[PDB]
Structures are given as structure tokens and as C-alpha cells.
Write a protein that binds this ligand. Sequence first.
Ligand SMILES: CCCCCCCCCCCC(=O)OC[C@H](O)CO
Length: 247
Amino acid sequence: MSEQYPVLSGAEPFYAENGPVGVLLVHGFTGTPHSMRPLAEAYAKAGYTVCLPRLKGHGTHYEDMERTTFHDWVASVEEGYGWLKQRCQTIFVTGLSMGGTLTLYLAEHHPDICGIVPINAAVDIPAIAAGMGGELPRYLDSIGSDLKNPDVKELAYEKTPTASLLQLARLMAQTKAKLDRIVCPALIFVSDENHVVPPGNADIIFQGISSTEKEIVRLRNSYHVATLDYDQPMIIERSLEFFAKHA
Ligand SMILES: CCCCCCCCCCCC(=O)OC[C@H](O)CO
């Protein structure tokens, strides 16, 4: 399958060829590279080779998204991973929300990942589970992003295909079940206040992985879309320190 709608302005992937250490940045469910771009540029400015891919069916139209499965999103991250492998001796992976879910997934299936930085990664959202409750419409209306800062507009679909929620749940289930395969260092960000993903998820992740070096930083001035919120500078700074520590 291939997207039927054109890529939208602002949703372009971002690539930067610099040093031998690479960072893969993964955006979230219904989102676009916009949400991860400031992190990618800061890392690029710091001298890192950077890959920020666009997930299949994202940044085009939600009908494209509707036609995808989580295998497609996984494939989009792998292409980015593969792109960095051609260029880098050392690879870190970071991601927001489902990007974090994809970050964990990637660490579960590659042995050569140097470290991961999941940010509000999703592994258990019981509400999504609803068994499947009653019959939901085909598309759920988005009512805006979970952000503390009101003057940020995040680039994301205005509707969510309910068919994709099932895809999300499965990605989460398989990622959660195989957490013990992650052995690389982990820097885990979690928002104290989060209206999307239960913040007890960070703990499931912290406990589930086999990593010998793992930490949690609780963000106290951000909601769910933390990468664009007030704690962005800390996320960027603390991440850079992680990369240098483990290079
Ligand atoms: C009946 C279902 C209600 C709950 C809907 C679940 C939505 C969770 C989406 C996961 C988040 C995502 O991966 O990225 C977050 C995105 O940037 C939000 O703007």
C-alpha cells in the first residue's frame, strides 16, 4: 500500500549528516515530524547525525493512516534506523508517545542500539482496550493536543481512525510483552500530569526492561506533548548528556 494523499507542509522528514554518532527521532500516533523537530535540530546543531522519519500514513491524510497497520509504522522507523546504520558507528533512539513505544520496540529488536530516550512512551492504556463497550464511529474527532503551553499548535490530524486504535493497542501489547529484551541504557521522561497516557506507564517500562543503567526524569511543567511544552529545554539538555555519557 502507498499513501494516496500528498505530504503536507510541515510534515517533512528531517535528515542531517554530521558526526559518527546518530540519533533517530520518532513522532507519534496521528502526529508528524513537527513534534520532534526542535529536538532533532538541537541535536544536529550539537554535531550529531540526525534522522527524523515520517511514519507511513502520517502527515498526509487520516484516510491514508486508516489504511496502515502498525507494521507500517515500524517499517518507517526501520528505514530511518537503516539510514543511520549506513553512516553511524553509534546509534541512539528517542521518541514521543507512540514514538516512544516504537523506540522501545526498536530496542527490543536490535542489539546494537546504544541508548533509548522514550518520552511519555505508551505500553498500557486500558481505555483503548475497551475489549474493542459500544460501537464507535469510524473517526474520532481530535479536540486539540495535550499541552500546558497554549500558544503552541501541534501538527496532527483532526480525526483519528478508530481502526488505527486497534493497531496501536497491538503495537503496545507486543512492545510491553518483550520489554525484557532491552538491555541498553535508558533515559525515561514522564510528565507528572498527563491526560493521554497514564503516567504509571514509565514505571512499567522502568521495571520491565533489563537495562543496567536506567533513569526517570519527571517533567513537572509539561503535559503529554512534552517535546513542544515548557520542559523542552530540559529534555534537549538532559538528552545530550545521555548521548555523551554512553557514546
Ligand atoms: C476511546 C479512545 C479514547 C482514547 C484515545 C487514545 C489516544 C492515544 C494516542 C497515543 C499518542 C501518540 O502516539 O502521540 C501523541 C500525539 O502527539 C497527540 O497529539
